[PDB]
Amino acid sequence: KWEDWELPCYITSFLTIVILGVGLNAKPDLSIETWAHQKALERLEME
Amino acid sequence: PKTWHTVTGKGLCAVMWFWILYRAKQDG
Amino acid sequence: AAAAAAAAAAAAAAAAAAAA
Amino acid sequence: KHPMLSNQMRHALPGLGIGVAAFCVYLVGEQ
Amino acid sequence: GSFLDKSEVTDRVLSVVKNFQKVDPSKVTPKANFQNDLGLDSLDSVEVVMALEEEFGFEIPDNEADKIQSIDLAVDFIASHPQA
Amino acid sequence: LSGLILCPVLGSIILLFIPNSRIRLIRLIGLCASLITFLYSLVLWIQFDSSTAKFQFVESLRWLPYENINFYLGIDGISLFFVILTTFLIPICILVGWSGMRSYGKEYIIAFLICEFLMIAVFCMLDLLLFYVFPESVLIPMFIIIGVWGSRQRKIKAAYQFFLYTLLGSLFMLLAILLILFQTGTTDLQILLTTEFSERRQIFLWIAFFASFAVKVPMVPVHIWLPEAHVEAPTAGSVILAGILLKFGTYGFLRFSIPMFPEATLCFTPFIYTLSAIAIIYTSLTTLRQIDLKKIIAYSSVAHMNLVTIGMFSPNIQGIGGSILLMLSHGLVSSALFLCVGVLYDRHKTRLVRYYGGLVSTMPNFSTIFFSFTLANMSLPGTSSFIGEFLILVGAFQRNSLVATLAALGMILGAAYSLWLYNRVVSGNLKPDFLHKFSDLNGREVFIFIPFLVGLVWMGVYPKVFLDCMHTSVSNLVQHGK
Amino acid sequence: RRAAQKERVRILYRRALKDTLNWAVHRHIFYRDASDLREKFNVNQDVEDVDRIDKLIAHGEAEYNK
Amino acid sequence: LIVFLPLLGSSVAGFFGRFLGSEGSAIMTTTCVSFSSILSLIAFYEVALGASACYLRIAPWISSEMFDASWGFLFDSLTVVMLIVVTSISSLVHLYSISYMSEDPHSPRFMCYLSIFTFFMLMLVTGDNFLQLFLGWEGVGLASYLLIHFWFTRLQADKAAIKAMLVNRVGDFGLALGILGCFTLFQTVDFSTIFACASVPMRLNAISLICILLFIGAVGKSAQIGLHTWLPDAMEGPTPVSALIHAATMVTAGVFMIARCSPLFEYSPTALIVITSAGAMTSFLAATTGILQNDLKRVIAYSTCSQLGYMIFACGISNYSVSVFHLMNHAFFKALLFLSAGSVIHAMSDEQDMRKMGGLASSFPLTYAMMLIGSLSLIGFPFLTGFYSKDVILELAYTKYTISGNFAFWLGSVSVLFTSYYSFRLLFLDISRCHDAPIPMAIPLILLALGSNFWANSLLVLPKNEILAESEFAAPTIIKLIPILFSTLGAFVAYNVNPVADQFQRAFQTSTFCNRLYSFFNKRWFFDQ
Amino acid sequence: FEESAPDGFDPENPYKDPVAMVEMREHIVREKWIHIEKAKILREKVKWCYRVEGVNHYQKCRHLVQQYLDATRGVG
Amino acid sequence: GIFGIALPIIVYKGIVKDFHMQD
Amino acid sequence: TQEEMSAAKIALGSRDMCAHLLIPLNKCRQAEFYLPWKCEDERHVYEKCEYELVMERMLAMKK
């Protein structure tokens, strides 16, 4: 954990781990379940 | 067990006898 | 992680209100 | 060591005599 | 407690020789073996063994029982054994 | 995808102009190129829409004008995270090689021959002719990875009759691919989906694909190449083999068997059922006979992969989800165990297995992590492999649960010998003759372990982000199988 | 080996005592029976022959089976 | 978050214990050498004991597609009950460990595994639908294994424990096949109306085979006589460890499933009779072949076998609530005497002599003295047991005879003879201190002796459901007197110096001495070889 | 997440229109998930019935739960 | 025995076929 | 007494047996913290009604 003592140059890999951490959900939605709870919910409105 | 604690710790098993007495009262 | 367990307890109160 | 083996019957119940007396005192109180 | 030094194991060898079933308290010594002056056979050897077993050692293998042949070997057993 | 697709090839070729005896630069920059291709794989994941039968990021380039058998590149559903796992794992091989000198094992050569994303190609390649070229093509990179830096246990070789059969099976699939290609001009996978074949010929074509596949898949009559290929494989050659080269056969079945030949698949369901079942039974009992650790993990991998087969059969969305997620969990778990056994080799420099003893003294953190992954290779419920295998199981959804009853033995013996071998390895203060050389794990070592454990737990507690991004595609596949 | 088997012949005295005492509290009963098994293995081996001593060791093993 | 507390404790003690130091809670790190302990798990854990019934809702778990997210539990007549029982047990075992630990440097990792055991048992006792239940169910099998070999003193012990754990595994697959068939038939997770679903409708007698597969699972996770995974091994591991497995993951977790699935055994009476048959046979045979076992530690398990066969029979006789309360109280009592065993084994750790019939029952501690209380109030006397949880359902077994017609089993389905016999077989059969039960060890025994009515009276809080109409019954009331005398025989007979009938030692008529079950009923019960 | 129920023009014999044949697959599977999620919504509503009763917690909805189940047929 | 499992495996296949004949 | 007994009590209990007096019993058992000393009189009256119930049902067991 010595950023200045990069004896094998792990800084690339650690920054990659940080970018994966910021690899958020992005809230894409756009799913078959997300679209289900709208279309089949209209179907529920049909009741 | 501490000797002072041991004297009052047992309770003399009197509470167990009360349970037997209440169970006997329920019987018959 | 005692105080970290307290942070998880804050998250736990959040999730409980989410159940409440 | 040797006294504990000899008084095992006495120590089978921690206060058998005192407990019976306490139980009798409780009865003479309930009545 | 106290640690098991050499004289600590000599005390255990003495507790072993304390088995005066058919041996003399004087003819059973740290050096005066039961077969030496007290008179021992497989019966008497296993007798001193079954006496000292609970008292001293408890880490003696069943194949080398008679290998002791003395109370100094019993002091050695109570000296090296993992139990004390 | 258009530009961010060719990161490993560009990196490899532009590094080929850097011989650079002083290794530091080639290691650093190859690792950075790998990590950025993995970053673009992951942003391609984020780019995904779990709502279309179409493929997510389609691209092409004319390859032969007539009938246009071109590089059709789709990443829908399964391929999405197959290429993700590929990238996920390639920096792992690049990172298991920060060895100081790495001289005879010339570092740039292994960099250039692991940084070939023909696995990415095949998983995105969506016209089964060029798709055919790639799994068979990756054999040239695999062979050089397997022995050039691979441990030499024998005169390096593979069973010659078995190898001839393995490649013959691969080329038998090629005849089937051509028969479909000229059957109706159908170049690519979308139109090979649309088209309809003769039931009399669908079965022949299915088994013809199945030859090569069930060689790539380790089914009971032909699976011996995994143990012999691994015990000689290098530390990073096994990580790739288990990781991807086994996924090849199951993904091949998934794309070019089930939605290709629905009637033939319907007809051969019991065939693959029994095949994979008896394969799991055999590879569960075998590690009794095998004492070799690499063979042990390879046979556990055979077991898991034939579970993937016993699940891919189904029109059960849960069925094929369990299939592909057992694939992901397997590319995680068996590769993590191969990482483990490679560390265990090197730190001990011994290739007997009875010699790994007193591990809790030498490398106890390795004991912890080795359990953290052997619970997975037996699929501790809670791990990713559990979600995978149990959706494999419930794959008896519209079924009548007679092959789950053979998966019974297949998995109970598997978990049993998993625990037995984890014991046998870490058991006792069995003092070895290593001259008080403890070999505690490296910070980079626990690093390269980090991502597998992270993926494993993140799946095992939250498989949504992987079952989602998949359901639309698999369900489309199923309805075409309906 | 008829008399050099001390470590061997005298070996299962404690074993007979214990497997005997393993039925009850067996303080008095098994203690007296342990002294008795001592006397039994002591009065034995009075023969000077390998075959008879072998029969005697067979009798001892049969006893230690009980 | 109310359930995941021991999981958190385990996750922090798993790594921070060996890198944190003196205090390790939040500050004072490695001021001295670590000496870290369970202190974190205890300070975080002891709160959950305050569980009291008020509506609580659900929370996400593995959101598989066919399955559901938002897992947990909603309040009924068993949720908080099992919760408080299991957290009491786990606190018990944790304090008893920190007593019995601190000498074996695998202690931190051990107690970690202990809390992971507790957490898997939780995920069982807190799963809304049986999929989380199967998660926790193979979790507790793996946890029983991880807890078996902590002491690890002998290796061939594990070389047998592997073939043992084969049975843990096959039971977990019994459960897996069961739940697979459920979702093939049920299509759902919710336990309320699945009774209505499957109550109306391979072999095509499926649903009954489903319930019996669930039973096979509940037994294959257990360790009683022929499904015993843990008997021949578990005592080399710490005493509270065997307490945990035998109490919780042997039976309690096995039957909490079938109780959450109580309507699922309701809808098939064929299933119910198949449970009752195997339960009564297991109790009968465990208690019966439980004759002349010689040890100082394992006899508690030698009791547990029958003491739980009777109870699984109770579950199978449609008195699921009765068996549940029986199991809470039996966990209590058997844990008290497990801790008594641990106290006397710590005594063996302080000296290596058997005492002269006065010290085999007490070294003169009052803190440990409650072993007599635990045992005798367990044995099946009308103190709080006997007619309670055993003999009323045996009065039902009288009617079970009236139905089936075999006047052998339910006449002697009470095993107070055998239980009392081997109880005393344990009670009987270098100077050390008069203070041999440490305080951090004994405080648990104190509070659990304290632990010994609105559940024992079940026809009050849940009175007269549809088919849950049982208890007093059209019964002859003679069982209110008869088995008390079997109890009294088993009580006084053992007061002799020789409880065994003479000439039992050598076999009868001098046939082969292998045909006796000694080599049989210790290693997988070896019934049909 | 914006699709259309019509599948263009597909006759029963699907070889003719590969465009329309793929579209029937991609949106009839959308209808498949329509009724699958309808069964799932009715299952959450079965849990809702159970939540509401809490004292019967099997009855007053159980036949309506059979109606729920009728979203699935052919149980044999 | 190995050929036994090989044929009993297709026998379980046939059991699936008998279940298909059940409806 | 069906649509009304559906409340505060499981599915009317027994309709043919007509327990008929669980109106204050459950109120006793649940209104307070259900400590052992809730109510002895309703307890014993329900025990005696269930006692004559057991009588009835044994005499139905007769034939």
**SS3 call for F100:** coil
Chains that touch B (3 or more CB pairs under 8 A): D, H
Contacts of H117 (CB under 8 A, 6+ apart): H140, H143, H144, H146, H147, H244, H248, H249
Chains that touch G (3 or more CB pairs under 8 A): E, H
Q: How many domains would you assign to chain K?
A: 1
CA H154 to chain centre: 25
CB atoms within 10 A of CB H155: 15
Concatenated DSSP letters of F202-216: HHHHHHHHHHHHHHH
Tokens of F133: 């070229």
CA distance F254 to F273: 15
- The CA distance from I75 to the nearest CA of chain A, in Å, is 23
Chains that touch K (3 or more CB pairs under 8 A): H, I
Concatenated DSSP letters of H458-510: HHHHS---SS---SS-S--SGGGTHHHHHHHHHHHGGGSS--SPTT-SS-STT
CB atoms within 10 A of CB H405: 7
Quote the radius of gyration of chain G (alpha carbons, Å): 12
Which among F26, F6, F8, F10 has a CA at the least distance from the CA of F18?
F26
Of I3, I15, I29, Cβ closest to residue F196: I15
Q: How far apart are the first and last CA of chain A?
A: 61
CA distance H505 to H498: 12
CA distance H285 to H228: 13
Cα dist from F45 to F57, F79, F245, F318, H268, whole Å = 11, 10, 21, 21, 49
H505 touches G at CB < 8 Å: yes
Cα dist from F213 to F64, F158, F171, H275, whole Å = 26, 18, 11, 47
Residues on chain J touching F278 (C-beta within 8 angstroms): 5-6, 9
B2 touches H at CB < 8 Å: no
List, in sequence order, every residue forming a beta bridge with F383; answer none if it has no partner: F381
User: At which residue do the structure tokens 């008069």 appear?
Assistant: H434
CA F240 to chain centre: 7
**SS3 call for H516:** coil
- Read off the DSSP letter of residue F196: -
Amino acid present at H120: F
CA F230 to chain centre: 13
CB-based contact F390:F264 (threshold 8 Å) = no
- Give the determination technique: cryo-EM
- The CA distance from J10 to the nearest CA of chain I, in Å, is 23
Burial class (CB in 10 A: 0-12, 13-18, 19+), H249: buried
CA distance H335 to H390: 19
H501 touches J at CB < 8 Å: no
- Read off the DSSP letter of residue F456: H
**SS3 call for D26:** helix
Cα dist from H83 to F381, H126, H134, H336, whole Å = 21, 8, 18, 19
CA F271 to chain centre: 23
H385-391 LR contacts (CB < 8 Å, sep 24+)? H385/H329, H386/H483, H386/H484, H386/H487, H387/H480, H388/H456, H389/H314, H389/H322, H389/H323, H389/H325, H389/H326, H389/H329, H389/H330, H389/H456, H390/H310, H390/H326, H390/H414, H391/H479, H391/H480, H391/H483
CA distance F410 to F277: 7
CB-based contact F376:F384 (threshold 8 Å) = yes
- Read off the DSSP letter of residue F245: I
CA distance C1 to E15: 55
Q: Domain limits at K16?
A: 1-63
- Note which residues in 6-65 of chain E have CB less than 8 A from chain G: 41-43, 45-47, 49-50, 53, 62-65
- The CA distance from H351 to the nearest CA of chain E, in Å, is 10
G58 touches E at CB < 8 Å: no
CA distance H438 to H350: 12
Tokens of F326: 């057992």
Concatenated DSSP letters of H65-86: SSS-SSB-----SSHHHHHHHH
CA distance F251 to F128: 12
Cα dist from F438 to F96, F347, H297, H409, whole Å = 19, 8, 38, 62
F354-361 LR contacts (CB < 8 Å, sep 24+)? F354/F291, F355/F432, F356/F293, F356/F425, F356/F432, F357/F427, F357/F428, F357/F429, F357/F430, F357/F431, F357/F432, F358/F428, F358/F429, F358/F430, F358/F431, F358/F432, F359/F425, F359/F426, F360/F426, F360/H106, F361/F429, F361/F438
Amino acid present at F344: L
CB-based contact E58:E81 (threshold 8 Å) = yes
Residues on chain I touching K11 (C-beta within 8 angstroms): 56, 59
Residues on chain E touching G7 (C-beta within 8 angstroms): 63-67
Residues, chain J, total? 23
K6 touches H at CB < 8 Å: no
CB atoms within 10 A of CB E56: 23
The three-point CA angle H289-H294-H299 to 5° equals 70
Judged by 3 or more CB pairs under 8 A, whether H touches G is yes
Which among H382, H160, H144, H406 has a CA at the least distance from the CA of H277?
H406
Residues on chain K touching I59 (C-beta within 8 angstroms): 11
- Note which residues in 1-20 of chain C have CB less than 8 A from chain H: 1-5, 8-9, 11-12, 15-16, 18-20
- The CA distance from J9 to the nearest CA of chain F, in Å, is 5
CA H303 to chain centre: 11
Judged by 3 or more CB pairs under 8 A, whether J touches F is yes
Which among F405, J1, F28, D8 has a CA at the least distance from the CA of H176?
F405
For the CA atoms of F337, F338, F344, F349, the dihedral, rounded to the nearest 10 degrees, stands at 170
Concatenated DSSP letters of I12-75: S-TTS-HHHHHHHHHHHHHHHHHHHHHHHHHHHHHHHHHHHHSSSSSTTTHHHHHHHHTTS---
Which among H340, H317, H328, H312 has a CA at the least distance from the CA of H388?
H328
Which among H159, H287, H150, H167 has a CA at the least distance from the CA of H219?
H167
**SS3 call for H59:** strand
Would you say the C-alpha torsion F437, F440, F443, F445 has a positive or negative sign? positive
Q: Which of E4, E54, E56, E60 would you mutate first to test chain H, the one with the most H CBs within 10 A?
A: E54
Domain limits, chain G: 1-66
List, in sequence order, every residue forming a beta bridge with F59; answer none if it has no partner: F73
The three-point CA angle F162-F168-F170 to 5° equals 105
Which among F385, F359, F374, F217 has a CA at the least distance from the CA of F302?
F217
Tokens of G20: 């005997």
CA distance H187 to H184: 6
CA distance F69 to F128: 9
Quote the radius of gyration of chain D (alpha carbons, Å): 14
Which among J9, F43, F119, F301 has a CA at the least distance from the CA of A20?
F43
Tokens of B25: 């009262």
Tokens of C12: 């736990």
Q: How far apart are the first and last CA of chain C?
A: 27
